[PDB]
Design a protein around this ligand. Structure first.
Ligand SMILES: OC[C@H]1O[C@H](O[C@H]2[C@H](O)[C@@H](O)[C@@H](O)O[C@@H]2CO)[C@H](O)[C@@H](O)[C@@H]1O
Ligand SMILES: OC[C@H]1O[C@H](O[C@H]2[C@H](O)[C@@H](O)[C@@H](O)O[C@@H]2CO)[C@H](O)[C@@H](O)[C@@H]1O
Ligand code: NI
Ligand code: NI
Lengths: 370, 370
């Protein structure tokens, strides 16, 4: 069972967990309460299982999309920031963590995928997806490749799927229609078909995952990658001369990455709710707190106004916001877990040649819908 | 086309490529020849495509199993070590690189998978695969897991498949019978069935790859992993107090890891063959040469007798040889690429629920064969 008198925190391991731990040490120094930061694998799936039994972390960090489901299942404590605190963050970030009229998590940062490119290999990155095959031919002749990114998680291919018409659930007047899924319209099909053609024509490998893409980019094996702000720190360390820019267009339309608000929720089963509120409100969501995390691994555009105002001048953040503006904020509805699983299956099956793009997305639509 | 007057080397990125570059620095100093060490993704699949055209690296490093195919395809230079030099390496290593009566690569080191475990989480690691599921249940109660290893590459699952009867090709009197495959007998089925039941019962996850397992073990998230000597370096850098030991038995029989001899072959289209020979014979295959590579990432038991005599005292090396002794040296026949592809497909489909184990191995039996 969750222990009283300490805080256990779960956060994805590609985020600045060491920096978050620094905020934890500061918390312990002031309160005597020990803070343990952990990054279990597949934490976003482990949470619902263990929290159901009254176990797991006091605080869970994830993009807001998963939180509606946690809330519907009664896994989250309703949070109680007063009016002064709420005023400290951008109103739209609060909207992302609202579910059935209740705030169920604290917004931290706004994430969106960007095109990352090696300036020495590619001083002028492609403006369109359509340009990528020829770049790859040219680079292959130098023992390099044009583009590598994670093909195991649908999050990374979604921008291309959505670019020319793909969407998750139809949204009208502040309500998602869970029976109206947009993963199998002409736009979605066109997008995935292009991705699969890249693979068939040997410009990408269906096996490529996050670690393989990161290694390749950071070692100058590939000219481009697609990734979030968290990834910039490792590139800095690699001494690759990189730029961050708008994603390529597809059929003349911008790529539309799903926008995630990194959020922190409080386990409904936690006997440490007040401590968790104190930690999140008085320590983490301050200029000093977000600074420590961000210095470890960049957060992106933070929810805290005072600190975003000082990050805003960073061109990498301007590119992130530009890509966010072109994309869409993720739904937070409970149906999202089913949506993602359906799209992951379709992309893997189509990329590997197990099913046609059309069969893959037709099953995803059915699987995702109610 | 391959440039005259330099050496380009390809080696897997998880091995000691920076150490190897150091050997290259000394080679340049004595011979005037610059050495470039590269670690392309999927280098062992890319090599035959580019080599057939006269392109690629001067020297390729990979386990010996891939080299029969390269040699049969006309892509490797026959090597010419005199008897004095041949006497410096273990006779069985030369056997691994002999194909159609010709030596086709220089043996470097002998690799075998071992069980690696965290002595603090699990001071008493299992003697059997069979006690793993309950150990996992027990570790889950403490917020950890029992075992994580790469489920994307069949190499890592093979020891379990073979433990109780699985095999690649029937071997008799120095000849492999390529029409007699053993991936679909009672033993192979039992092995794969145990693995799939692990995943089914949430003791492992089918998506787990090399980077995920390494991250998990090196951060104290899981009590055990399965990996080779090259992995020990990063574990040393980690906080983890670890041990390396014999793999668990299955149905009472030892796990049977395929044993690879890391070997260096010379591209048949290299205009630098004499230089490649001098590099490999007079620089790399010396105590000082292998020490430089080994200090970067452990090689395993090396092929050079003089140096292996110094490494043999290492209990990690003792465990490596014990597991190797219980396993089988891989065939080097051209048919091995089709074997591995067939097995990869079977494990991924079985582990993910796409096919039953029986249907997966039934298919693999026929695909692997001729
Ligand atoms: O791939 C599906 C996955 O997408 C999103 O997860 C992101 C997460 O938002 C990012 O912060 C980062 O960690 O990468 C993840 C993708 O690997 C959704 O948030 C998630 O629910 C969904 O499963
Ligand atoms: O997984 C199939 C794969 O197994 C072997 O590859 C090993 C290699 O021998 C090791 O040195 C290390 O790099 O890990 C590899 C597995 O990821 C075979 O040598 C290879 O041909 C085969 O594809
Ligand atoms: Ni982790
Ligand atoms: Ni590499």
């Amino acid at each position: 069972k969750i222990e009283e008198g300490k805080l256990v925190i779960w956060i994805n391991g590609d985020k600045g967990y060491n920096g978050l731990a620094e905020v934890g040490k500061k918390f312990e120094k002031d309160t005597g309460i020990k803070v343990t930061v952990e990054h279990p694998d597949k934490l976003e799936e482990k949470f619902p299982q263990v929290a159901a039994t009254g176990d797991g972390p006091d605080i869970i960090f994830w993009a807001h999309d998963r939180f509606g489901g946690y809330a519907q299942s009664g896994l989250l404590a309703e949070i109680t920031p007063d009016k002064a605190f709420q005023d400290k963050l951008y109103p739209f970030t609060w909207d992302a963590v609202r579910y059935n009229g209740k705030l169920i998590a604290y917004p931290i940062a706004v994430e969106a995928l960007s095109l990352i490119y090696n300036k020495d290999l590619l001083p002028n990155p492609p403006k369109t997806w359509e340009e990528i095959p020829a770049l790859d031919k040219e680079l292959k002749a130098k023992g390099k490749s044009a583009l590598m990114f994670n093909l195991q998680e649908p999050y990374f291919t979604w921008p291309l799927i959505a670019a020319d018409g793909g969407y998750a659930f139809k949204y009208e007047n502040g309500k998602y229609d869970i029976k109206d899924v947009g993963v199998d319209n002409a736009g979605a099909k066109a997008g995935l078909t292009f991705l699969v053609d890249l693979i068939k024509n040997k410009h990408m490998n269906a096996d490529t995952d996050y670690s393989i893409a990161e290694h390749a980019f950071n070692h100058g094996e590939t000219a481009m990658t697609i990734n979030g702000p968290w990834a910039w720190s490792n590139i800095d360390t690699s001494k690759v001369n990189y730029g961050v820019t708008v994603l390529p267009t597809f059929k003349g339309q911008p790529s539309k990455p799903f926008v995630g608000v990194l959020s922190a929720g409080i386990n409904a089963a936690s006997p440490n709710k007040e401590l968790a509120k104190e930690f999140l409100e008085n320590y983490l969501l301050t200029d000093e707190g977000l600074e420590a995390v961000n210095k470890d691994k960049p957060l992106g555009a933070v929810a805290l106004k005072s600190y975003e105002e000082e990050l805003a001048k960073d061109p990498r953040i301007a590119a992130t916001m530009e890509n966010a503006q072109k994309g869409e904020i993720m739904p937070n509805i409970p149906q999202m877990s089913a949506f993602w699983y359906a799209v992951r299956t379709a992309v893997i099956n189509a990329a590997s040649g197990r099913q046609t793009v059309d069969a893959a997305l037709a099953a995803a639509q059915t699987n995702a819908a109610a």
